[PDB]
Amino acid sequence: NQALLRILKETEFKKIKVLGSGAFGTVYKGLWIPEGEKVKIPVAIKELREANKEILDEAYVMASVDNPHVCRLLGICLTSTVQLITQLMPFGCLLDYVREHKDNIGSQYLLNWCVQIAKGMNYLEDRRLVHRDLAARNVLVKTPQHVKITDFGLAKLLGKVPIKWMALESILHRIYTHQSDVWSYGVTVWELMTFGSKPYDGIPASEISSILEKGERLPQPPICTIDVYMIMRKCWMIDADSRPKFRELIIEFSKMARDPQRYLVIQGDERMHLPSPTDSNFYRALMDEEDMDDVVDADE
Ligand SMILES: Nc1ncnc2c1ncn2[C@@H]1O[C@H](COP(=O)(O)OP(=O)(O)NP(=O)(O)O)[C@@H](O)[C@H]1O
Ligand SMILES: [Mg+2]
């Protein structure tokens, strides 16, 4: 649908500050200045490094993604460069969030984030869409209780490879499927449960396919019980059809969230509950009016 993607003129918005850059482009905090208005509305703008018909075709798919746990493409400006406009997320990405909060995050948040990421990826799988670059850096925090997958469509649009997130078949043959996204999901879960450790830290990207072929995998995070680590390891089976399905991961992590201290061991966890209804309501009113499923609370 034409209606989902806004074509912006360069005069309608301005880049203000670089937020960073990765494999496909550079992101800026920007301002949208709607013509004839005096308001300045914060947005994120991603300008791609390095056709228009093909670009717009993929942009319309990206703009069609409508799920509480996946970011939608809102607008595009095609000039000499491709610029992608999306909602700005002040909390930033979940990788930085778990690093910065390494001592104040409880099991309920971690297990619910795993549910939310699996729900967003399952939505993509149901639409027959493959992400190709899932990682904790590509999950954005809308509120601490609500996360969203970002950068859907970018890898396809432009495809340093994120070797350390990639299924072995993607590394060796650039094969990407829902089940290779499941491998990346397992790495993403490992990043969360380690509070943002670097996977395979110190090992050169060029050594990784050899390590995987020998059967070596990312280590058990100290907070994870064996059932949680077995899920991660199942995501990294060489046989892609032996890996879990995202819909299975929604079920498993939701079950775990109903008994969180049975599945993760975190110092001080009893002091780290989900927000009260009062605090949740206040967050939603200021930052998060969109429809979403209830978070999974503990039975006890
Ligand atoms: N909508 C957004 N709101 C706020 N920060 C954002 C948004 N989108 C991206 N960022 C941040 O902008 C920076 C650049 O992102 P990006 O160019 O996608 O690199 P990356 O996520 O680190 N790696 P990759 O996506 O794998 O290429 C990172 O710090 C992102 O977290
Ligand atoms: Mg990114």
Side-chain angles (χ1 to χ4, degrees):
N1 176 21
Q2 177 175 1
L4 298 184
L5 181 65
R6 175 122 183 197
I7 310 303
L8 291 155
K9 300 173 301 212
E10 213 161 7
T11 48
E12 280 192 86
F13 62 93
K14 63 182 178 179
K15 299 184 273 308
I16 303 295
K17 192 222 312 182
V18 161
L19 297 181
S21 61
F24 294 120
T26 304
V27 179
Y28 307 73
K29 172 174 179 171
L31 292 174
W32 172 49
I33 331 287
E35 193 208 50
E37 302 291 1
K38 73 183 190 181
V39 297
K40 301 185 172 183
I41 307 304
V43 292
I45 306 174
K46 183 164 197 171
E47 192 167 45
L48 298 191
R49 310 166 170 287
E50 157 95 307
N52 271 11
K53 181 55 173 49
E54 274 157 73
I55 298 168
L56 283 174
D57 282 338
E58 184 49 35
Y60 283 117
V61 178
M62 299 159 69
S64 78
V65 167
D66 193 334
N67 178 263
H69 300 294
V70 192
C71 298
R72 190 168 84 78
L73 180 61
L74 304 182
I76 190 160
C77 183
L78 300 181
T79 57
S80 56
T81 66
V82 174
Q83 293 184 86
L84 304 173
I85 300 290
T86 60
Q87 192 170 39
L88 183 68
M89 304 279 250
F91 277 103
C93 72
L94 183 58
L95 178 58
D96 294 338
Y97 189 91
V98 297
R99 286 175 176 174
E100 291 182 19
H101 290 277
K102 194 176 196 304
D103 291 328
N104 300 270
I105 293 174
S107 53
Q108 293 194 276
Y109 279 95
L110 286 164
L111 288 170
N112 273 282
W113 294 333
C114 291
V115 172
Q116 290 184 24
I117 291 164
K119 285 179 170 185
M121 289 307 297
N122 184 237
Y123 170 86
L124 295 177
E125 174 162 10
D126 281 341
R127 298 279 320 275
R128 308 195 161 80
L129 303 173
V130 174
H131 189 293
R132 307 183 175 208
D133 189 22
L134 179 62
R137 63 182 176 273
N138 284 335
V139 182
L140 289 172
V141 178
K142 191 171 184 197
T143 69
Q145 306 81 51
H146 181 176
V147 301
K148 307 180 67 162
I149 296 153
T150 192
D151 282 336
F152 171 68
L154 271 296
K156 169 164 191 165
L157 208 40
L158 290 96
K160 185 190 71 65
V161 210
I163 292 291
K164 290 178 183 177
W165 284 259
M166 290 164 57
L168 179 62
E169 71 271 19
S170 307
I171 296 176
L172 297 177
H173 292 112
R174 294 303 191 262
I175 290 170
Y176 298 93
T177 63
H178 306 304
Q179 294 311 99
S180 62
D181 277 346
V182 167
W183 181 298
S184 302
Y185 177 87
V187 183
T188 297
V189 173
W190 184 92
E191 290 180 276
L192 304 185
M193 299 298 170
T194 61
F195 307 97
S197 298
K198 299 181 180 174
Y200 315 103
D201 186 26
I203 305 177
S206 60
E207 306 189 5
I208 294 297
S209 59
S210 168
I211 286 173
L212 300 173
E213 282 162 358
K214 298 171 179 180
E216 306 185 15
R217 290 303 186 276
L218 289 166
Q220 181 168 1
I223 71 169
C224 293
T225 62
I226 192 64
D227 289 337
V228 178
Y229 188 55
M230 290 297 279
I231 296 178
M232 257 169 272
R233 290 289 294 251
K234 196 178 166 180
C235 291
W236 306 323
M237 298 295 285
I238 297 303
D239 181 35
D241 288 329
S242 296
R243 298 172 197 151
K245 300 298 296 179
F246 288 117
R247 55 191 165 72
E248 292 164 354
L249 297 161
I250 296 167
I251 291 162
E252 289 311 306
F253 278 101
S254 291
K255 285 168 177 181
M256 296 182 168
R258 294 191 301 267
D259 195 355
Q261 294 179 30
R262 177 160 311 273
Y263 295 102
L264 298 174
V265 180
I266 294 169
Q267 196 118 42
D269 206 19
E270 69 275 5
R271 298 191 297 275
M272 291 194 295
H273 290 161
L274 290 180
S276 69
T278 299
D279 288 351
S280 170
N281 281 329
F282 189 74
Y283 257 121
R284 290 193 46 86
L286 292 177
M287 307 192 66
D288 191 16
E289 296 190 274
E290 81 176 298
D291 299 341
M292 174 184 153
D293 298 334
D294 290 328
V295 295
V296 183
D297 202 348
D299 294 343
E300 266 139 76

